[PDB]
Amino acid sequence: QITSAKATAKTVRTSPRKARLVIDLIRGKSVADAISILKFTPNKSAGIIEKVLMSAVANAENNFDLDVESLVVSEAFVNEGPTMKRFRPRAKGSASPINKRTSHITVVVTEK
Amino acid sequence: VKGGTVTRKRRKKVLKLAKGYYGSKHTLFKSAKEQVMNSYYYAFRDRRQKKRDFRKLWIARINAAARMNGLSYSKLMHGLKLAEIDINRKMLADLAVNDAAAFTALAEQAKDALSK
Amino acid sequence: MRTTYMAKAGEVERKWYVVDATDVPLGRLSAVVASVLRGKNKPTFTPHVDTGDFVIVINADKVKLTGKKATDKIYYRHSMYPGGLKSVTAGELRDKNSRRLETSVKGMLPKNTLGRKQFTKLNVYGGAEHPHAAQQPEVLDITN
Amino acid sequence: MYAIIKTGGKQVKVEVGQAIYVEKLNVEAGEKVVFDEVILVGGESTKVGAPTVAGATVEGTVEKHGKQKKVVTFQYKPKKHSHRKQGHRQPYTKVMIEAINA
Amino acid sequence: MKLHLKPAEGSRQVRNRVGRGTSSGNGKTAGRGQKGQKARSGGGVRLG
RNA sequence: GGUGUAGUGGUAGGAGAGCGUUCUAAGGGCGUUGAAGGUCGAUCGUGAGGACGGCUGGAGCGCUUAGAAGUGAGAAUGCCG
RNA sequence: AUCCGGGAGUCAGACUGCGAGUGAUAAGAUCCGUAGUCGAAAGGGAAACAGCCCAGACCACCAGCUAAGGUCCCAAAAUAU
RNA sequence: UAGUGAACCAGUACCGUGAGGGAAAGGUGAAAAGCACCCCGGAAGGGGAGUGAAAUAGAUCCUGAAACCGUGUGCCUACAACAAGUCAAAGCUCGUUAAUGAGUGAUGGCGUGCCUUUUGUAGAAUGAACCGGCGAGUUACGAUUGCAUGCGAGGUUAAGUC
């Protein structure tokens, strides 16, 4: 048999450093604690990893498993995606570039 | 003629002589070639200071174990070269550590020679 | 690669010695004591392993200073602040802190991390009595 | 047993049933070698000799002919233009030991 | 003697390519040394 | 071709012999039972460099003799990404 | 060593010992003769040090003898007579 | 990044009132058979199920290096002055193109990067943020010398015709 369903979300418009903070608060914790943690952090990268955990839990339910109450978040990644590029007029004629970055967020949910 | 796969064979043969270097290295092809060169300087030097160092080590151990028998740190040399005994100082170091009986035998013959 | 004893950290047995200081000058006490604490006069060197011994020094109040130097060897300290030399000491330290006169052997050793380990095997007592009698020390004569 | 034996320019300790790493000998694999110069003989009652103790021959047999690893020796001199590149790899002979002095 | 050939001995030299690295003997200023108008591009005075 | 004696630091520079890239010709070869390229390896030669094996990869490429060159990169307050 | 040809670099040199000049018989000054080292020279000594004393590396080894300079402890060798 | 500046709707987009200047951008598979249907989600995006020899070939679609950014772990690190190496080396882990093995490294000796220009550099003279690609003694006509080849008191064609 198998365990550990996956779920990803590609090219999400958040900076990748500011989403590596929230994923440090989940690694190794059960699924019961993690949703409760993510509901009470007022960051933008809270309301995304919520949806990634809920989709991973739903994959594990409605494809393979039972025992929603015995699942543990064992791995979580943030990888960098394709950056947009724009400009901005600085003073005295010149200009300066501006990155606009994207991240790839994955969550793996083993049993225990 | 393009320059396809000629540079990379060089640069990766350089990097594989440069595994285990403190920092950037590993991954910089300009600053990993340099410490390979300086490592070759230190290899040239240090193949020729192995031989200096162990003379000093075995001399210090011969001095200690010779002073254990009352002989000074040098009169073993003069005493053995009058008695026509020509051991390397490596083997005198090993005998002076292990064979206390044989080292006292050699020390007594060196006492016997210069007792004229 | 061949055979010489690179001794290990837990093979060397150490001892405890007693060295008097009644009317011997500083240089020669410190010379013999500093040659002891590196593990010399034993055939089992490494230049790594602490093959030294333990030295206890008795009667530090009665150490000779030959000729002059009684009022003359001005030590010096500076304390990293402006106008901060303190030449407070002299040959006064024979009377007050005769333990401290732990400088003329701390100079004699290397300044590695073995010259900090091997310095902590001196126990210099100004009086004439151990507190360390439970470890059975021995005596060294000095005709050196 | 001890036999401090001059071989080549060097001196080695010798026991029975061991291997030595010796410079070349011009003897083929699996033949007999008799080392002649013996400085000290050990065991219990050591026999110190003014050089080459008389009546002391050390036998022995040769396993292989093989080499050390390479010794890369590159020289350069800074801010000028130089490259000397070499490589060196000496051969050596193992020696099994039989019958320290008969 | 057929298609798969030998020249005469000494019949054909190779070349000498100049400015290709400091161990052939002609890298870094190409057999011209330091500065001066024999070492610029197209320099050198007229004949005589 | 055993064996003697002697020699072997080096900038500008002079001289000699080799390594490697792409193409042409002739001969002999490999390849859907896996070619070129990429990655890893504790391998060989005095040098530049050459093999062998494991993974990836999906249509071409080596070897020998001679020839012809857009034939080798670490620096230009180099140019492009 | 000379002669006949093919091919170059170099025309800013330094300091030290010894003769002189200008200078104030001042300078790591300047300008000449004369020898060495550096330039184009790595190794040992003078604490560290291009030019000073000793000495010129084809390469390997956990062998041996000496130079200049040294031998109470950092640091190898006499607490020498 | 070659070859026309232009392999693609290029003298176009864009820049200057104007004369003028002027780019980047090729590749799924044989066949679109380009993922019906179910689940999470507002959607994007994903996990099954299928098409397919292969989907880690899913449209930014052959292969996919380097700088750069992450995850997990075998070894080490909180009295220590370190051009960051090399030489010596205890312990701990591992098992190769089989051999005088591989990783890591408590601790000790020694040790002022790379170029260019200079009588002299570690220089506080002068250059490089890093990685990748491109990027410099050639050809025609003459002259002279060495080597080789065929003739040799002789040698040899040119323009031009088939």
PDB file of N, CA, C and O in Angstrom, chain D residues 50-79:
ATOM      1  N   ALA D  50      79.249  -4.151  17.061  1.00  0.00           N
ATOM      2  CA  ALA D  50      80.028  -3.325  16.154  1.00  0.00           C
ATOM      3  C   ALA D  50      79.815  -3.846  14.737  1.00  0.00           C
ATOM      4  O   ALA D  50      79.885  -5.064  14.530  1.00  0.00           O
ATOM      5  N   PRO D  51      79.668  -2.960  13.741  1.00  0.00           N
ATOM      6  CA  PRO D  51      78.590  -3.103  12.748  1.00  0.00           C
ATOM      7  C   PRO D  51      78.584  -4.424  11.996  1.00  0.00           C
ATOM      8  O   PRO D  51      79.634  -5.016  11.735  1.00  0.00           O
ATOM      9  N   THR D  52      77.368  -4.870  11.652  1.00  0.00           N
ATOM     10  CA  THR D  52      77.074  -6.153  11.012  1.00  0.00           C
ATOM     11  C   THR D  52      77.554  -7.322  11.858  1.00  0.00           C
ATOM     12  O   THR D  52      78.649  -7.841  11.615  1.00  0.00           O
ATOM     13  N   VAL D  53      76.806  -7.627  12.927  1.00  0.00           N
ATOM     14  CA  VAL D  53      76.952  -8.812  13.776  1.00  0.00           C
ATOM     15  C   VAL D  53      77.232 -10.068  12.961  1.00  0.00           C
ATOM     16  O   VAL D  53      76.454 -10.430  12.072  1.00  0.00           O
ATOM     17  N   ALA D  54      78.335 -10.742  13.267  1.00  0.00           N
ATOM     18  CA  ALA D  54      78.794 -11.857  12.458  1.00  0.00           C
ATOM     19  C   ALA D  54      77.986 -13.107  12.757  1.00  0.00           C
ATOM     20  O   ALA D  54      77.669 -13.400  13.911  1.00  0.00           O
ATOM     21  N   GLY D  55      77.668 -13.850  11.704  1.00  0.00           N
ATOM     22  CA  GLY D  55      76.818 -15.012  11.835  1.00  0.00           C
ATOM     23  C   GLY D  55      75.364 -14.622  11.977  1.00  0.00           C
ATOM     24  O   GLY D  55      74.685 -15.059  12.909  1.00  0.00           O
ATOM     25  N   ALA D  56      74.869 -13.798  11.058  1.00  0.00           N
ATOM     26  CA  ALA D  56      73.508 -13.290  11.174  1.00  0.00           C
ATOM     27  C   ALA D  56      72.967 -13.033   9.773  1.00  0.00           C
ATOM     28  O   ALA D  56      73.217 -11.972   9.197  1.00  0.00           O
ATOM     29  N   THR D  57      72.212 -13.990   9.249  1.00  0.00           N
ATOM     30  CA  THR D  57      71.587 -13.874   7.941  1.00  0.00           C
ATOM     31  C   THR D  57      70.078 -13.951   8.104  1.00  0.00           C
ATOM     32  O   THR D  57      69.575 -14.784   8.861  1.00  0.00           O
ATOM     33  N   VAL D  58      69.366 -13.096   7.382  1.00  0.00           N
ATOM     34  CA  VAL D  58      67.916 -13.003   7.459  1.00  0.00           C
ATOM     35  C   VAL D  58      67.342 -13.396   6.110  1.00  0.00           C
ATOM     36  O   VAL D  58      67.596 -12.723   5.106  1.00  0.00           O
ATOM     37  N   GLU D  59      66.574 -14.475   6.081  1.00  0.00           N
ATOM     38  CA  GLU D  59      65.972 -14.934   4.843  1.00  0.00           C
ATOM     39  C   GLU D  59      64.663 -14.199   4.585  1.00  0.00           C
ATOM     40  O   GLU D  59      64.273 -13.301   5.329  1.00  0.00           O
ATOM     41  N   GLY D  60      63.980 -14.583   3.508  1.00  0.00           N
ATOM     42  CA  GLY D  60      62.710 -13.965   3.175  1.00  0.00           C
ATOM     43  C   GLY D  60      62.301 -14.126   1.726  1.00  0.00           C
ATOM     44  O   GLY D  60      63.149 -14.378   0.867  1.00  0.00           O
ATOM     45  N   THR D  61      61.007 -13.985   1.436  1.00  0.00           N
ATOM     46  CA  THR D  61      60.485 -14.168   0.090  1.00  0.00           C
ATOM     47  C   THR D  61      59.710 -12.935  -0.347  1.00  0.00           C
ATOM     48  O   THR D  61      59.236 -12.150   0.476  1.00  0.00           O
ATOM     49  N   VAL D  62      59.564 -12.799  -1.665  1.00  0.00           N
ATOM     50  CA  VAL D  62      59.021 -11.605  -2.306  1.00  0.00           C
ATOM     51  C   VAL D  62      57.634 -11.915  -2.848  1.00  0.00           C
ATOM     52  O   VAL D  62      57.461 -12.869  -3.611  1.00  0.00           O
ATOM     53  N   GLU D  63      56.647 -11.110  -2.459  1.00  0.00           N
ATOM     54  CA  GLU D  63      55.311 -11.288  -3.009  1.00  0.00           C
ATOM     55  C   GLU D  63      55.148 -10.598  -4.357  1.00  0.00           C
ATOM     56  O   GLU D  63      54.933 -11.259  -5.374  1.00  0.00           O
ATOM     57  N   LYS D  64      55.243  -9.273  -4.400  1.00  0.00           N
ATOM     58  CA  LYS D  64      54.807  -8.548  -5.583  1.00  0.00           C
ATOM     59  C   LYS D  64      55.807  -7.484  -6.002  1.00  0.00           C
ATOM     60  O   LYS D  64      56.804  -7.225  -5.328  1.00  0.00           O
ATOM     61  N   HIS D  65      55.507  -6.871  -7.145  1.00  0.00           N
ATOM     62  CA  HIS D  65      56.157  -5.659  -7.635  1.00  0.00           C
ATOM     63  C   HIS D  65      55.057  -4.651  -7.933  1.00  0.00           C
ATOM     64  O   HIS D  65      54.264  -4.852  -8.856  1.00  0.00           O
ATOM     65  N   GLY D  66      55.008  -3.568  -7.166  1.00  0.00           N
ATOM     66  CA  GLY D  66      53.940  -2.603  -7.313  1.00  0.00           C
ATOM     67  C   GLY D  66      54.404  -1.219  -6.921  1.00  0.00           C
ATOM     68  O   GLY D  66      55.525  -1.027  -6.453  1.00  0.00           O
ATOM     69  N   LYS D  67      53.514  -0.251  -7.092  1.00  0.00           N
ATOM     70  CA  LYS D  67      53.882   1.151  -7.033  1.00  0.00           C
ATOM     71  C   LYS D  67      53.113   1.883  -5.946  1.00  0.00           C
ATOM     72  O   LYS D  67      52.100   1.402  -5.438  1.00  0.00           O
ATOM     73  N   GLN D  68      53.607   3.068  -5.599  1.00  0.00           N
ATOM     74  CA  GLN D  68      52.873   3.983  -4.742  1.00  0.00           C
ATOM     75  C   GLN D  68      51.917   4.805  -5.597  1.00  0.00           C
ATOM     76  O   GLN D  68      51.794   4.583  -6.799  1.00  0.00           O
ATOM     77  N   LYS D  69      51.215   5.753  -4.992  1.00  0.00           N
ATOM     78  CA  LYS D  69      50.375   6.635  -5.785  1.00  0.00           C
ATOM     79  C   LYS D  69      51.198   7.805  -6.289  1.00  0.00           C
ATOM     80  O   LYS D  69      52.301   8.063  -5.807  1.00  0.00           O
ATOM     81  N   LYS D  70      50.649   8.515  -7.273  1.00  0.00           N
ATOM     82  CA  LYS D  70      51.393   9.582  -7.924  1.00  0.00           C
ATOM     83  C   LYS D  70      51.624  10.759  -6.991  1.00  0.00           C
ATOM     84  O   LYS D  70      50.929  10.954  -5.996  1.00  0.00           O
ATOM     85  N   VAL D  71      52.648  11.531  -7.324  1.00  0.00           N
ATOM     86  CA  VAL D  71      53.100  12.663  -6.521  1.00  0.00           C
ATOM     87  C   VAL D  71      53.139  13.841  -7.488  1.00  0.00           C
ATOM     88  O   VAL D  71      54.111  14.032  -8.222  1.00  0.00           O
ATOM     89  N   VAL D  72      52.069  14.609  -7.530  1.00  0.00           N
ATOM     90  CA  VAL D  72      51.953  15.676  -8.514  1.00  0.00           C
ATOM     91  C   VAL D  72      52.755  16.879  -8.046  1.00  0.00           C
ATOM     92  O   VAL D  72      52.535  17.399  -6.949  1.00  0.00           O
ATOM     93  N   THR D  73      53.705  17.317  -8.870  1.00  0.00           N
ATOM     94  CA  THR D  73      54.681  18.329  -8.469  1.00  0.00           C
ATOM     95  C   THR D  73      54.649  19.486  -9.457  1.00  0.00           C
ATOM     96  O   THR D  73      55.439  19.508 -10.399  1.00  0.00           O
ATOM     97  N   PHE D  74      53.789  20.468  -9.225  1.00  0.00           N
ATOM     98  CA  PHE D  74      53.652  21.599 -10.137  1.00  0.00           C
ATOM     99  C   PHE D  74      54.318  22.816  -9.499  1.00  0.00           C
ATOM    100  O   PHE D  74      54.008  23.169  -8.361  1.00  0.00           O
ATOM    101  N   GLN D  75      55.233  23.458 -10.222  1.00  0.00           N
ATOM    102  CA  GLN D  75      55.871  24.686  -9.763  1.00  0.00           C
ATOM    103  C   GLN D  75      55.493  25.890 -10.602  1.00  0.00           C
ATOM    104  O   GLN D  75      55.357  25.804 -11.825  1.00  0.00           O
ATOM    105  N   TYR D  76      55.364  27.022  -9.929  1.00  0.00           N
ATOM    106  CA  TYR D  76      55.001  28.286 -10.537  1.00  0.00           C
ATOM    107  C   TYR D  76      55.769  29.345  -9.774  1.00  0.00           C
ATOM    108  O   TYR D  76      56.187  29.117  -8.641  1.00  0.00           O
ATOM    109  N   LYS D  77      55.963  30.509 -10.380  1.00  0.00           N
ATOM    110  CA  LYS D  77      56.556  31.620  -9.654  1.00  0.00           C
ATOM    111  C   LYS D  77      55.706  32.856  -9.915  1.00  0.00           C
ATOM    112  O   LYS D  77      55.390  33.153 -11.075  1.00  0.00           O
ATOM    113  N   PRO D  78      55.300  33.570  -8.871  1.00  0.00           N
ATOM    114  CA  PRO D  78      54.175  34.497  -8.999  1.00  0.00           C
ATOM    115  C   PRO D  78      54.554  35.756  -9.752  1.00  0.00           C
ATOM    116  O   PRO D  78      55.703  36.195  -9.723  1.00  0.00           O
ATOM    117  N   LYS D  79      53.572  36.291 -10.484  1.00  0.00           N
ATOM    118  CA  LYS D  79      53.639  37.505 -11.301  1.00  0.00           C
ATOM    119  C   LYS D  79      54.628  37.407 -12.451  1.00  0.00           C
ATOM    120  O   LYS D  79      54.968  38.425 -13.058  1.00  0.00           O
TER     121      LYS D  79
END
